[PDB]
Amino acid sequence: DNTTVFTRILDRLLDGYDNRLRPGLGERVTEVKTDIFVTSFGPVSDHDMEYTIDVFFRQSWKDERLKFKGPMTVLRLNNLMASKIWTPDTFFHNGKKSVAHNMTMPNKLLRITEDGTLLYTMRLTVRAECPMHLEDFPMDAHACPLKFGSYAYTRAEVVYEWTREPARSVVVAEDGSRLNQYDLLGQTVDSGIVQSSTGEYVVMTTHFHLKRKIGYFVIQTYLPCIMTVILSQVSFWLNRESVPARTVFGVTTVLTMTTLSISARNSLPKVAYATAMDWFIAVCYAFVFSALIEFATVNYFTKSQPARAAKIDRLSRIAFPLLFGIFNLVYWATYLNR
Amino acid sequence: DNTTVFTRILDRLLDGYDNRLRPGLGERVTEVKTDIFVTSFGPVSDHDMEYTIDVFFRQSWKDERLKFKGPMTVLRLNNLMASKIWTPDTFFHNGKKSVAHNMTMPNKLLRITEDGTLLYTMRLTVRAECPMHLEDFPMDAHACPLKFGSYAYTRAEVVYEWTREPARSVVVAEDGSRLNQYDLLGQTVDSGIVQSSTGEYVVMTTHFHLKRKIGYFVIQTYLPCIMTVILSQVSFWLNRESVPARTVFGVTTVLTMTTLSISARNSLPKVAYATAMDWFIAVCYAFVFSALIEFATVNYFTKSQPARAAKIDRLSRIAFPLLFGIFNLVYWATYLNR
């Protein structure tokens, strides 16, 4: 019996309500407050230059056609009431394939205050494009954006605003980080304007700033390559009588660098420019290939100009370790400072 | 203004029309003319033993409940009309998971003539099972079929016939070949009867004949194996006393075949028998071991019967090159014609 009063109120609002017209059509501009709660920041894929994010996307506007009076000032209604009224057609400009979860029911809420103000939130999983500049891989950083706005209403009809100060209108859950290798340092919230072939639209933007963590690549790639190079220079200290032994060092060391280079090539995303890792492998490849050449030269002069052959080995015991030490100083100081 | 005349015609035809009864129920048999236009013969997957195909599946039957009089003799109606009239429930017997395209609108058409004859086509992406026999791999030749017929109507209620002569009722577009490693040799069209527990049903068949292209295997597998066998027989020219040299050269060749043999079978589907590729590799194995066997026999006769060891080695320098050459001609001539 108590619900009968609320049944009349709901049936009174929807009577004569045409949901095909935005509020204040041809009279003013519909203002839509917006804020986002990031429940979890999903993994970032370098192979596809995309990322995933789950949001409690909230919207709020004013519709004078839904004013009422009753026992309760707020009508916490069901998500099926949303389809009966007008709602913004907000989409994501750089979204690739987003999902609006509807398990076990459509994840939407609708609340109508007594003065017509509406609150209409939903749970989304947006996968967005994020262009990446991988010149300084794996010591690189990015700023993945997230742009959303109206699809059919120009900026003279619908304008989007943040509910609070732009810094505090996007909140990230403390435990939501699902990033394996990246590290979310912070986010920036901004607003902008776009001008398509149909008109001018208001675009709300938010950039998430990510810096990759170098820990994995030091263990997998950098340290084994350095050990292999240091292993290569061991051949210089062996006495000249163990000629067959030095042959093993030259052949196996070169072959080892092939395995590391190929295995580390899989982690390299498909690009058309030389990354920072490629320079390190290319230089380390030269040192190993230089040792084999050096051993070839000494073995060539041996038993023909033995005095000259021993002179090469004395210098090689110093030149090779010194240059590889200098190269590390130049390589790391150049990239780590950026 | 004149659209009201056509609106009356459409509203009159569907007034009292019952879309649960086939045309001529209790009077005759509903004949469904059929023809297929293949726009793209999709990839063939040996591992799944399936293939993909895009078609313009055209059907045509007669319904006397849709006669009308009007200025136009043909009504090219929207595809939304097709959901309110009776249509054949044709399905594909060996179809795994077909797709009906829905972009940007349901890819269907419906045309009604003045005598009730209907035309009703659609665009599909059909995946069909194709049993294969890989005895003659990689020189095999498959015949992937395509069967379709009614589901809920036995042969005493619905019968399928080709729109034109059976040869010309299935047309393949010239640019409709997406096959990478096959050649479309032409299709064969036939019709038959399938009897199940529920009753007897009409089934229409369309076999597509395919022949594999051998270009990728002659370079990849046969040439490395042919060279290795030929390279193996050079040991007959060195000497008989160098036991360690000839043995090492002989055994290493066997290892070369083993590496080639396994590396040449990972492209094969995981069948449980021997293909024509393995037989050629099997023969090459016998030749390689034969060269080693001849050396072993020569070794034991070297100290006792040098004349016996002398004649055999000279003979084997001409015997095997002729023996292997004759085998290739017999092997190749057989399979190319078969």
Place this chain on the structure above:
Amino acid sequence: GDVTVILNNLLEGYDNKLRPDIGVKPTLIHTDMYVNSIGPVNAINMEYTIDIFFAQTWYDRRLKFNSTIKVLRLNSNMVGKIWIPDTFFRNSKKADAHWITTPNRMLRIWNDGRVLYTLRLTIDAECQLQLHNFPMDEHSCPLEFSSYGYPREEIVYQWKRSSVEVGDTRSWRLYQFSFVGLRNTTEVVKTTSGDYVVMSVYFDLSRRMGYFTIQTYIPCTLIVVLSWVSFWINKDAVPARTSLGITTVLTMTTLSTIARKSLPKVSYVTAMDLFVSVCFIFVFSALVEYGTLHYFVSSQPARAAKMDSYARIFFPTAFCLFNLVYWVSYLYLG
């Protein structure tokens, strides 16, 4: 015209929310199943795909009509009007009916109320695989279906005389295994929302060992035998005898990498891994044997002479002894 009148009369006042004989007696449902094919048996996901023409038959007093027409043969358009049992498959990871070009469904109603319902289904049933004996394993993959919301007092399933029918076995996509037979049972499962009658069908499968014999077993065994030629070659030919050993180890590692790629990853050690690992040991030990011998020439040359002679016997005897154990155990473990 008359058929339209008959159909309208049947669906006049019919309430599809209520099962037949709701307050009288349980509904008896007879089922059939024709198996089109059995898809691949996935080792990684422990599942298999099956394609069937599921059939059901029951009675309904609300669908009785008197006319000269005996049987009404209808299309899928009438399925959403009459009451349909909510049969589901209890061990299905992902199943879906076929909808090209129309819903592949059948509905036939007799004049005494009997209803026949048939549809085509593709089911990814869940089957627990024991890959301990790979590639010489066997399985009995089940398929269980039962009513969802109706307990044993409302819906009772029952097989017919010809319960499960199979067409041409060789036409199936299943080529890694070989079909054996099928069994069908009927039991009652007690859950938190009543007791539900469950029907089961078991399919017995056996793997085909032919592929791995040619691919792996014959080559790996061949490699180990070839490594033994080093023994008969004179110990003085260091360039020769060493070259033979190095090539063998290089070749064996290549197969060990190739073989390990096709093996489905598990949390234990299969027979195939055991056989390849043992073969990789013997070829390496053959290289180790000469390496120790070359060192022992300077230190204990008298001890070195006996080392080569023992190798010609110890290696072939141990491998043959191990090989007989491997086959007897793994072909008669259980």
Place this chain on the structure above:
Amino acid sequence: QVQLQESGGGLVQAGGSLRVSCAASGRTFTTYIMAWFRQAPGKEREFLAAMDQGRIQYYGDSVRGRFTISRDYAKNSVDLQLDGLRPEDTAVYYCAAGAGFWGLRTASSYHYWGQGTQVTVSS
């Protein structure tokens, strides 16, 4: 070597259009953000406008509704239309390009920079 050369500008009197253009060379800035910075004499360097790859236009709070930025991706260049110029607009205008790490309104986020172009408004 990547260079950002500018043109346009000059002397204008109490408003009126004055278009300033910037052209890049040596690198394709299709995937970067090309902005515009104004540096009043001795005060500081101020953000004016920016445009990323998606043609999204950002503006400062003091030039909103007056200036207009418009890239030309084919020619790898960016323009900036000035309207209703004021005496307070007399400054040097700079051309920047970068990925906008830690925001796009911060000069520290633009690695590449232009030489500059003096713009003076008469009174």
Place this chain on the structure above:
Amino acid sequence: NMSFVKETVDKLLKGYDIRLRPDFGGPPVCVGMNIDIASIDMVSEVNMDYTLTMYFQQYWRDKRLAYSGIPLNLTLDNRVADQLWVPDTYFLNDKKSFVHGVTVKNRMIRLHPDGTVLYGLRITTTAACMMDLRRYPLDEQNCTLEIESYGYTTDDIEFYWRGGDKAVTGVERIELPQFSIVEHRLVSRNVVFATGAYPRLSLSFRLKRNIGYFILQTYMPSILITILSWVSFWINYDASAARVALGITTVLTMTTINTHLRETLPKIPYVKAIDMYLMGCFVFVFLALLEYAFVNYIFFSQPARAAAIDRWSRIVFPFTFSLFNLVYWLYYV
């Protein structure tokens, strides 16, 4: 008879407002939940997720659906759910879930004479649980499943497990190829967002990895190669070809183990407990090879000092390696 059953049901649906929860604008409604887990699988460290299949059931009371004169628990067809009010229960940490629909939508409705409704689904969910692989493969994960209402606050709906700690069943039958279920726990609490406070239920499992596989697959090969490296210390330095081959073989074998093992896991930044062992072992084989070169370099000038190094290496290296294992194994276990 059946007409009376049909008449009673039609009366309930007539005048029913689906848009209003039971006791709208009054006392909060109570929903009891039972879960019967059918299978857990695809626990992947790559995606940090697990796949769960369950018979999700809800149990609340609506006074508008009360009927009298029919002493039975009506089990209506599942399509009647669209005409009734059901709770908007959602799983917070789900990524891709669906309700099975063969041969119909797996869903039940069972009204009771007092108005109680038993609504149950059959859901396959790919929930998300981040994993801490610092102690891998000796780790112990804890994957949960957050059950929460979406649109209704604690003033409207209240959750609680039905049957106490016996609400969730079927855990025992679960078999996981790599993990083993140790303990499951049930939690009921509230969560506060910017829109209000909402009820929440939490089902959590504690998974401990089966260490038996790695010991006989990775840890054992690492130890044997490391011990195989010390054999050079009992070989005369004049055999440079043999001693160098032993050292190189150990190093290359150690490298292959490191590369091959690192193609089955996500690109975590920290050093997993497995990586410490491989790095720890790689030093010993590298040092043993590096030690020989120093011996080989100097023994020409003075064999007396070089030979004593070999005898002293036969003790320092085995003692150092055993100490490392004592530190490493007791640091984690």
Place this chain on the structure above:
Amino acid sequence: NMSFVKETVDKLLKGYDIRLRPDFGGPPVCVGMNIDIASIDMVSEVNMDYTLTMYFQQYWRDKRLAYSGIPLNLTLDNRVADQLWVPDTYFLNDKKSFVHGVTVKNRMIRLHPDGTVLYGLRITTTAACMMDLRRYPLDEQNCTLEIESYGYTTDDIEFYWRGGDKAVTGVERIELPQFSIVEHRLVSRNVVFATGAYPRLSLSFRLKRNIGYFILQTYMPSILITILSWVSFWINYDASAARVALGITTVLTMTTINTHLRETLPKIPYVKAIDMYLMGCFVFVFLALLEYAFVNYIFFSQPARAAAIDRWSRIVFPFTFSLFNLVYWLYYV
């Protein structure tokens, strides 16, 4: 005022017949298409397809939708598109396409006082284009996109690009990681099928692959190994240690290069240009290694002729390899 617009809109849709195209049984209706490309990505050689995202607008006049008294361009909710007549435009070479539906279905409907209707959609279509990889990676691919009406012939509907060559916008902003869009072209023509003649608009891109990193990553390692294999010819056979090391390293390294690339490139029947060079380099480095083993076996017997072989081989290999390189490049460039 607000009620006036509702009255005007409901006036139009009352009696509107969706089943009939505008000007049914009369002149064909002209439809103009604008495409605003958003991104092109994943140009897969293995699947012979590319992914395209765009804004797809269509313009046409419907006399039934003309309204008066409201001097504004009405922009109705996108759900009104289910009640109007829209062209059945499809893409012939499309494989898997969808219209984005977050947060709502991305769709636009605009009316004009004269009846002109703008109908926009956001589509991510995975079109198909076969590629001739014979000259890979020094090849150009001409990938297209087809637009055609399905159920309406040229007697009912007519297509035309809106704005001439300016109909398609946003091509320059595309930055493919591996390709480079040289040019795009617009074509309008008719297609004759068995059921009639249909209008067609064709948009085609010509992609030229970037060889900037293929030269560095592939050809230089092949050439350097090939040249490195020649150094063994100038080394005297008394220093045979170097020759063995050079011979073994080159072939094994070359073998690894040839195998690794095949596992990381699309698989096809024809012999790609990249395979010819790898096959050529592998043969040359194999003959050089085999050349040494020939001399080593024989130099003890006839050192006069054996040492003379290397003197000529210092010419044959550099001469033949240069000639082979000259033929290859002038045949594939």
